[PDB]
């Protein structure tokens, strides 16, 4: 074996980057990719200032140590040195600019060995406990003569850029600020034939904006307390149900992570799951599917807004569905007139006739989601009857319990009006919504009946986390969690290709939602209250590749 | 410095027992515990004959080898002084292995013997005079583990001589007559450290357990510590809760019994559960959005933590089928489950100032057989008002089984304020495929300590019912838990049940002749081979 220098010494680098206020030539469908986040650092300083999560961040990894392991590497080096026979620090290196750029008060970094490279300056021209070398090769002289942990590349573009050229990097711990700012230096392009994301970890808020940290890796060219798992697992089988018509080769990028942290690889892991011991069936006849019986998703809306990365996602019609559920109304030619196709094939006259609908006008779509939220209990008549102060007005009624009674635990706002099912065009597959209220914070479970995973989940994750905010702030309250329960779980077989390729996108930190603050009254919103910022995404996937 | 046979030449020991017939009274014991367990032969044969499932694990565990990890062994014991393991057995033992499984395959076949002629058997097939002339055949051969498939005598004196590392115990949950019996294990010399998932096979479920001596690449390692660099260092509520008293629960390595699925929720309650106060002065601790999964083919999920009744919650079953909203017709059957929920007051201070004592209105049963109709009082007839969901179902179920509208929902928002008290039990839904049927039921507010163990068994109960009545075998019985909370009153007695091991689950039975769901009595349902903990008060307040 041939051991390089990167790996014997441990040499990583760690840095965050933004997104580079762009020169947007008149194109708001802008193309992603890994470049997008390569901002890092304006005038000197950070192009957002400061960011306690990432700082909290940065300073875990180059302090950590494991003094246990340390014997194990001190041979490998020493070995490597031909080199044979008070506490365990990292090291730190930085360009001067970066070095200079650090507030007294932090110089020298705590806990960690600093090393300064520098041409301008000589030792005498530093008062710190520091080490001032003028040349990467100086560094690989001093590490083989320190008791050292590992080795953090700290910043500067230019030091950045020539550890990388000198091919002395041996993972990048990337973190990814998911917003905007002015910037004059940026990180070196990462040729992705040289290194590869191993590990995505969640996604969090701080400062205003959301943010993850992924790593990148060099690319290629008690035991016996153990064995008792290997028992357990005995009657066991040995391949996935449909491994051989669905093939792993396919879900290479996939595979190939360590760490899938990412929020987004809850509704990821769910479809690889169903792909992978799905099973068979023909939900309708003729179509066919992959099946499976219960899930649940959780996710953070107070570090995020979970909108699906790994493909493009416009909300502008699940927002005016709900807000149309808000009214109360069950009349479709609303949102065709919006331009909102969502309800189309299920208003038409073959469609509510083959549903025995026949006295029911075109588009009515009957005592749905809008009636039962508003009126439930009422006997549905019409799309243009006032049912005012007839049946439960649910919405109220909740959005009263979580003002009034935060602890109770019947707050639920329901769909499946039993009654009414058979005079809807489609009985809802949102069952119900329920409420959760502690210290200040509001979450909401919400039971889906049938999912399907390829096309309505990713939109259904969206209108129930906006729904969650909308109720949470007419409450006076955070929002916490959405948490998505699946009932039947399906994924149609002409989604299958379209899905493998999904799979193997790495998600990008998720975009944030912003709420006009006015707005306290669950009925007082309109589309223009909404805003999804700082979504990034891949590119637009169409589910059925038909033509 | 190693000294101590047992651990320093790796000795194990493999068993299974079932549990044992007394002629004065023949089952349902008083009293369970480890002992239970120790039904080991009966005259020169198994108690149960044959069971396949741990026929494959004996195999797989007595063939397994891993040569890797082989010279750290070789190191030791050389330094102490195609890669088999050893199976030592005793003459009666080795006589009652088969013709055609003699020697045991891929193993060194050793024998304890007095009489027995090295010189007719095999060389492969080694033979010794007594116990310590094994130690010896072991500092010359080259295998992996040494496992003692033993034999009532040859379990005994390797227990007592302290020769046994681990105990890898086979706990068949059905009573067989023996003769022939394994020696009572000292529980402060052996501890269990595993229980696998439960099984069912050759009629009867089992489960296993290992039980062990009381001693008494990274490259993506360090990741895994930065990417929970945000993370509380301690527990939320771990200094009310104290780890010490989950010391066993915290000792077990594998916890894969269905039971911890329970268990575990009870555990993240009270380490990260956050505390509410009730408008009653009453306080807990709450999380929201679990999902539990049980798998109905493998066994019936009473837990054996504890002890739990059935016949209430049973009985509570059939008068929903029958869509009863009449809590007498349960008190006077001495179920009082409801009764609570009936009296003056309690109706009165839902503001039921019109309903009848006991009249509770159109809950559960009126919702399973008439969602829809205006409810009038506990004694009217509804016959063909509002919509038959449990009829519906059904139906779905036989006619249109991939059908994903299969639901069965008791919270009809119209009729709320009239019912005694809102459902806990929202919605079941049901899944079919290959012949057989899951269940989803979605609980709104759970009481972790005292109502999820029996919301659990009743829904179990129920999908076998439904998968009777409709010709599938049930599979699944999924529970989603909204509002899970436990009653600060529970909190000791939840310690407690946490620190005992789970024994292997029971069956339940059914009349088969039952093919109509509203044709089911109290005689149709048998729980059989329940083995549990003493019942446990969850409010030690009396
Ligand atoms: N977002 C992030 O993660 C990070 C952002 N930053 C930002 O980046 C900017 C600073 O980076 P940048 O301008 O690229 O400069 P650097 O901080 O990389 O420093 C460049 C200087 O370091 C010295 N140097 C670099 N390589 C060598 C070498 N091989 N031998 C000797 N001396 C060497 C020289 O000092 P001299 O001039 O004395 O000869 C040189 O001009 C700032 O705005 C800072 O806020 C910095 C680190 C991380
Ligand atoms: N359920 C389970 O996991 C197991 C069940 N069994 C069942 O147990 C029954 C057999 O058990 P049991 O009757 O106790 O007999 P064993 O199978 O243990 O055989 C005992 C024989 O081993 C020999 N022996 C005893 N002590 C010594 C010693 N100190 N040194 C050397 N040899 C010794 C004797 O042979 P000799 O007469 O030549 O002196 C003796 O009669 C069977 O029905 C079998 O099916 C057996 C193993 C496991
Ligand atoms: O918001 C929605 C609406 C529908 N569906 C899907 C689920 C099913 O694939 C199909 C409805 O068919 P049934 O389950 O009702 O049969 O539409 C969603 O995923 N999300
Ligand atoms: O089958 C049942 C019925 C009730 N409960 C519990 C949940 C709550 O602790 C209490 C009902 O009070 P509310 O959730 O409605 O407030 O009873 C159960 O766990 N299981
Ligand atoms: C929050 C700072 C930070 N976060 C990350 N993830 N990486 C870094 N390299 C730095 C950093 C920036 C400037 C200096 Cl001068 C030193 C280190
Ligand atoms: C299926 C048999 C089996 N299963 C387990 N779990 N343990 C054992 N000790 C045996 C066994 C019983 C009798 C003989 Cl003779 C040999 C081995």
Same mark, same amino acid.
């Given at each position: ?22 020169? #947007? ?104 406990? +520091? ?97 008792? !798992?290997?028992?357990?697992? !005995? ?23 360590? /760490?899938?942290?990412? %929020?987004? /690889? ?39 807004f979970?909108l ?5 996602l416009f909300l502008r019609g699940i927002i005016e569905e709900l807000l149309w559920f808000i009214r ?7 949102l065709?007139?919006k331009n909102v196709?969502i ?10 006739? #083959? ?6 006008? +075109? ?63 489609? %009985? %809802? ?30 939109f259904?994750?969206a209108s129930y986390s906006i729904f969650?905010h909308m ?38 930190? !998720?975009?944030?939602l912003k709420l006009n603050?006015?707005?306290? #009254?669950?009925?007082?919103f309109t589309i223009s209250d909404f805003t999804i ?15």
């Amino acid at each position: 074996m041939m051991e390089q220098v990167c790996d014997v010494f441990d040499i990583y680098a760690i840095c965050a980057c933004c997104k580079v206020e762009s020169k #947007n030539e008149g194109k708001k469908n802008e193309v992603f990719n890994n470049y997008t986040f390569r901002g890092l650092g304006n005038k000197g300083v950070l192009p957002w200032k400061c960011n306690s999560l990432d700082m909290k961040y940065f300073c875990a990894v180059t302090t950590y140590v494991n003094e246990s392991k340390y014997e194990k590497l001190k041979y490998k080096r020493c070995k490597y040195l031909n080199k044979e026979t008070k506490k365990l620090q990292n090291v730190v290196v930085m360009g001067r600019t970066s070095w200079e750029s650090i507030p007294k008060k932090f110089k020298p970094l705590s806990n960690r060995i600093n090393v300064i490279l520098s041409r301008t300056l000589k030792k005498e021209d530093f008062d710190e406990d +520091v080490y001032i070398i003028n040349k990467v090769e100086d560094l690989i002289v001093l590490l083989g003569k320190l008791n050292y942990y590992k080795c953090f590349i700290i910043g500067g573009s230019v030091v950045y850029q020539e550890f990388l050229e000198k091919k002395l990097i041996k993972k990048i711990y990337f973190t990814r600020i998911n917003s905007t700012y002015e910037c004059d230096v940026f990180f070196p392009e990462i040729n992705e034939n040289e290194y590869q994301i191993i590990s995505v970890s969640d996604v969090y808020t701080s400062n205003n904006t959301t943010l993850d940290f992924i790593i990148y890796k060099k690319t290629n060219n008690d035991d016996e307390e153990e064995d008792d !798992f290997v028992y357990f697992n !005995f009657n066991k089988e040995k391949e996935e149900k449909n491994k051989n018509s669905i093939h792993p080769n396919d879900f290479q990028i996939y595979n190939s992570l360590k /760490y899938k942290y990412h %929020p987004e /690889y809850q509704y990821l892991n769910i479809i690889y799951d169903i792909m992978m011991n799905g099973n068979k069936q023909s939900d309708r006849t003729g179509v066919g599917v992959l099946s499976k019986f219960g899930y649940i998703m959780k996710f953070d809306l107070s570090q995020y807004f979970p909108l699906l990365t790994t493909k493009k996602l416009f909300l502008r019609g699940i927002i005016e569905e709900l807000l149309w559920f808000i009214r109360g109304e069950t009349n479709g030619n609303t949102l065709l007139n919006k331009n909102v196709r969502i309800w189309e094939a299920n208003g038409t006259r073959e469609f509510l006739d #083959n549903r025995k609908l026949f006295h029911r006008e +075109v588009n009515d779509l009957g005592p749905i989601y809008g009636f039962q939220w508003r009126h439930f209990g009422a006997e549905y008549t019409n799309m243009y009857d006032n049912y005012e102060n007839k049946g439960v007005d649910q919405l109220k009624n909740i959005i009263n319990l979580i003002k009034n009674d935060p602890t109770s635990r019947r707050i639920l706002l329901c769909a499946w009006n039993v009654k009414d099912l058979d005079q809807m065009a489609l %009985p %809802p597959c949102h069952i119900l919504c329920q409420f959760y209220v502690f210290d200040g914070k509001l979450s909401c479970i919400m039971y889906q009946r049938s999912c399907d995973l390829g096309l309505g989940v990713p939109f259904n994750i969206a209108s129930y986390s906006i729904f969650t905010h909308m109720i949470a702030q007419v409450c006076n309250l955070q929002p916490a969690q959405f948490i998505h329960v699946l009932g039947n779980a399906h994924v149609y077989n002409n989604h299958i290709d379209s899905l493998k390729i999904q799979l193997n996108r790495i998600p990008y930190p !998720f975009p944030t939602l912003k709420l006009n603050p006015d707005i306290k #009254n669950i009925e007082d919103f309109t589309i223009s209250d909404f805003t999804i910022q700082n979504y990034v995404h891949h590119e637009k996937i169409s589910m059925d590749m038909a033509a």
